[PDB]
TrEMBL record, chains A, B, C, D:
Lineage: Eukaryota, Discoba, Euglenozoa, Kinetoplastea, Metakinetoplastina
CDD domains: FBP_aldolase_I_a (cd00948)
Organism of provenance: Leishmania mexicana
Cellular component, GO, one term: cytoplasm
Cross-referenced PROSITE patterns: ALDOLASE_CLASS_I (PS00158)
Reaction equations catalysed: beta-D-fructose 1,6-bisphosphate = D-glyceraldehyde 3-phosphate + dihydroxyacetone phosphate
The keyword Cell membrane is assigned to this record: no
UniProt-listed GO biological process terms: glycolytic process
Keywords attached to this entry: Glycolysis, Lyase, Schiff base
Full protein name: Fructose-bisphosphate aldolase
Family recorded in the similarity comment: Belongs to the class I fructose-bisphosphate aldolase family.
Gene name for this UniProt entry: ald
E.C. numbers: 4.1.2.13
Length: 357, 357, 357, 357
């Protein structure tokens, strides 16, 4: 019958995000998916450093926090293995030894500066007890734009899912998926490549199968929400958990099993265009983190995306102990740091050898 | 096959919100749905008062803002027609002439104190140009809880939808519905009866039919999201636009047409349990606002919910002019205010007579 | 940016079903919602009559099936209490004693002829064991159009939901909702008022609360799918189960409890425009059926729709026994039939008195 | 709070289809994804042969239909290039020259026998004029099981989408996606590998960009529905249209552009586990079909799935003309058939040379 002239942008089929940063976002994703490189996640909260530093009797202060980060960021040669670093908000404004801001410093070393833009976990208040949402969308663009102006080119936002009794509430599944998808859009509009982090927590007694089933359900909805919001696929990354048995389940999965379940889960849910998957390491030992990624990278299952790491403790633990919080500890700390980074770089290439650890 | 023991709260069918404030929320809804009463919407932004006050040469200051509100809130006898007032955040902390906070003052007069808890409109960044989302969910509970502690018992949050070319994007429809539904839950968990405001804007050249079609589509999704979030139906209110021709469409609908289209649209979308519908008046003249509500209240269509008003300018315009911003103007301003309030009180009872205006 | 001219029918907001039968469907709904009247459900399968007739030693034959129906349909004066009858496909083509087809006969008596258009239950093959879908959408219009040509003006389609362990699968919830919603559209396009039957089965040991929770979840999705398909609300009816304790739960709910839970559940889910709710009686005794509907009709909860009955066994049981399958039994059978029909007619008016049974 | 024991099958995360045919379906997919092989689509309706045969003055009869098919199916050596054939229902029951049923015959030649199980296109009756749904789910399993018993191991079902004014209705997008997803499940439960065909039609004046945008939107929803129904990803295939300019748009896309847009669209929507994509050729010339697939197979974009053909006219046109419907024409017809099949086999390997045509 009747015809009406509308904006094409009002049509469901024409909803892909329109951002003038498109091409630079893709260029950043190419940098972030450089073979044999991965990301250093150095976005730990101020708060967390208190516990972190106790073992090394380092007081949790702003300057000592800068020194902890500089331990890794000014470790000469890390660039060979790290393509970008997810910075904490505080660190963005900190200076390296030469006076440059960390973002300036990294960039000049060819490393992309990134920033954790989420505002933390809060009770979901829907769903099951212990479920949590993530805050930070309010005023997002203003924040992201100032980060961009400071040299950041990518960001990270984490939502969690807690397996309890073998399942998670649909409330969580949907709502957290929606939060991730909106964050990805606002990031892209702000000139930041969004790394979308839907972490199914390792916590619990559940088995690998449960972890598999829950991850596939959770991630499929994250994808469904990202398609609903029209994300630029070519310009985003995923940082999921690997599929492993629960922390207290009593069992440890062999590398090949982990690879099998992980790669399978991803392929079942992620669109083939997804450029890269940078795994989180939570709850894994420094060495498993590397062994697991290596096996992932030897999997015969479909995996068109770059598979690599985005690790925190798995790159830092040994380093911090050797460093011990002292200037005199830099060298040793840095050797441990570089070692881990190399092991993971090999792991990304599927050439890791446990003999090297 | 296999059986597993779960939390009932992990089951889709058991998702209704669980809040210890349930009974008080229902009690507040009973107060808010008192026959022949409606709400005064006094939640105008600070900013807005600048333009508001220009005509009366009243400087936009904090004290003059308090005086503008006190013009209405301390008008003796308004309680006969107003069951609650939606306060602006600033006003919540302001004192009436007797030293009591406005919330204290209203309560003692038997009027429920309410608060606009949204954080304003922002570009949607999905969908069509000119579409907007609403911010404020971050830190919502902390804010709502402090309002509750100050005597507030209900809140208001407004999302808008802009008809362009006869339609609105699905992006808007879904996302704004989701925002409204989450806000309603958090409100309820915070002990505030949420008034859910999905305003299809009057702006444009569209006709009554288009307004009808868009409102029904928009509101149906708001309902769908509220069911998804498990709202306590018995404890919320709607504040929709009436279904009328567009502001610039060149046509004016008669009261009965407006009633027909409005009541029809609601009944088609709103669950019968919805306790009350407090209409917004945007773009209507003070007198149409009353005439339209009266006709609504004479409609032969189904309408189990209480149908009343939540007006701002439609209750205030005459008052402000008569008041003129001067102490000496109180009396006159208050008579105009009381008049409007009475006309709308009659309109809620379906006994309004234009002869009285 | 770019503008494009489209069919308005391609716009999400303009999706309400467009049928030239609109006005006649509404006229049929007005007939079907006549105060103090309800529907006789006489759509039992051929198969079922075998068991049905065993007690009365009546052989299950086509002619005896015609006689069973004629027992009720030619009972003079039933029209005072029955506004329409849901016929079985076979009966549509059967003749009353005067040579007229049943549809012709009913119409001339002012009773609307209806037809069960579903094709029966089948394993869902998704979801949990024992869940079932409903077939019959293929070739639907051709069938419905021939029924319309034969004098039918309304139809019935039943989907079931089986509570097991306190829940039903989302697979069932969605899929059956989709089936109901599509059937309603095709019916309307075919000039038949669709009665949408989402029966949460009485079967099991579950309690009234579980029945409540499951019904609300199931029905909310039926509504969500009907809105998605653009149904003409003004032109459809619901035939739900009442909310009662499970058949084997060991408990019997009092009439007022049943009314409370039932009316509440409906109001929470059904749009206020829904014209009528004609309850199914499955598993209730002839007398509870009447007592329950009466209480429903005295409920103080919101219920803008006409609340009445669509009963089968609850109108027939006594009748069939008195009839005993013999011509000589007509009189007695008809008195029992008329009695039940009157009791339910009173029940619709909320004036049923158990003293009368 | 409370715990309840349920069937794991009642949990959203445990919804993957459970079929005893799982392993054989995967084995069939391995056969169907043999390097350098593709499918011959010989599922043309009886009706269609009338027009098909006019040019060759062959009467449309059952026997001449058998002869048309036998032209290709008994062409010695086609097996080198064809891994399976999608048969028409009639052909399933036809015999090759040696007395074996076609399915028997193909199997013995190592070619998988398949069957088109959809029941045809019908007006959608929702959405925009000219939109169509696909029938055939009713009694699906009974039909599919008898096909399986006759030697079929895979099936095909086609739904279409018509670009009009640059878009398609959400009604179509959702409903057709739902139909495809349900068909895939029932197929799998019936021991048939389902080839899911969501054809965005070439028809119209739209450009390549529009085709891109619509295909991505349409296919993303097909994926979303398949995940909702729990399909066995490892056991299904896609048969989409390539992304090209509209038939009447006046423009012809070069092979590399087609490859770029096509592979991009798929990767953006299809899960990496999807085993294979067998393109439809509708509206392409025999030679473009081959050139386009070849370029597809040289694309540098991500494409973990096997990319090949499922062609009808693109494999048959030359053959039918040379055959001319005469026994004496077999030889020539078969050489043309074999030629095309070889060209496409090369195209699958990305080694097609136009010089060979």
């Amino acid at each position: 019958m009747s015809r009406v002239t509308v904006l094409q942008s009002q049509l469901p089929a024409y909803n892909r995000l329109k951002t003038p940063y498109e091409s630079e976002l893709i260029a950043t994703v190419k940098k972030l998916t450089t073979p044999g490189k991965g990301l250093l996640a150095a976005d730990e909260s101020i708060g967390s450093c208190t516990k972190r530093f106790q073992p090394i009797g380092l007081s949790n202060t702003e300057e000592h926090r800068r020194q902890y980060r500089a331990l890794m960021l000014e470790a000469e040669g890390f660039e060979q293995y790290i393509s970008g670093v997810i910075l904490h908000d505080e660190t963005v404004g900190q200076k390296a030894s030469n006076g440059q801001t960390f973002p300036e410093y990294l960039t000049a070393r060819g490393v992309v500066p990134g920033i954790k833009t989420d505002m933390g976990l809060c009770p979901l208040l829907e769903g099951a007890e212990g479920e949590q949402m993530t805050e930070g969308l309010d005023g997002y663009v203003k924040r992201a734009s100032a980060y961009y102006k400071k040299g950041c080119r990518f960001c990270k936002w984490r939502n969690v899912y807690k397996i309890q009794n073998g399942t998670v509430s649909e409330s969580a599944v949907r709502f957290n998926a929606e939060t991730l998808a909106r964050y990805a859009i606002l990031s892209q509009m702000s000139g930041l490549v969004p790394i979308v982090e839907p972490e199914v927590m390792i916590d619990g007694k559940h088995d690998i199968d449960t972890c598999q089933r829950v991850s596939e359900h959770v991630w499929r909805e994250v994808v469904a929400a990202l398609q609903r919001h029209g994300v630029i696929w070519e310009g985003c990354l995923l940082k999921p958990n690997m599929v492993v048995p629960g922390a207290e389940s009593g069992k440890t999965a062999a590398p090949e099993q982990v690879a099998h379940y992980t790669v399978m889960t991803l392929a079942r849910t992620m669109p083939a265009m997804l450029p890269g998957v940078m795994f989180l390491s939570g709850g894994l030992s420094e060495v498993q983190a590397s062994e697991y990624l290596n096996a992932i990278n030897n999997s015969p299952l479909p995996r068109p995306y770059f598979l690599s790491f985005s690790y925190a403790r798995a790159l830092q633990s040994s380093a911090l102990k050797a460093w011990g919080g002292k200037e005199s500890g830099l060298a040793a700390g840095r050797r441990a740091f570089l070692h881990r980074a190399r092991m993971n770089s090999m792991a990304q290439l599927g050439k890791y050898k446990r003999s090297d650890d």
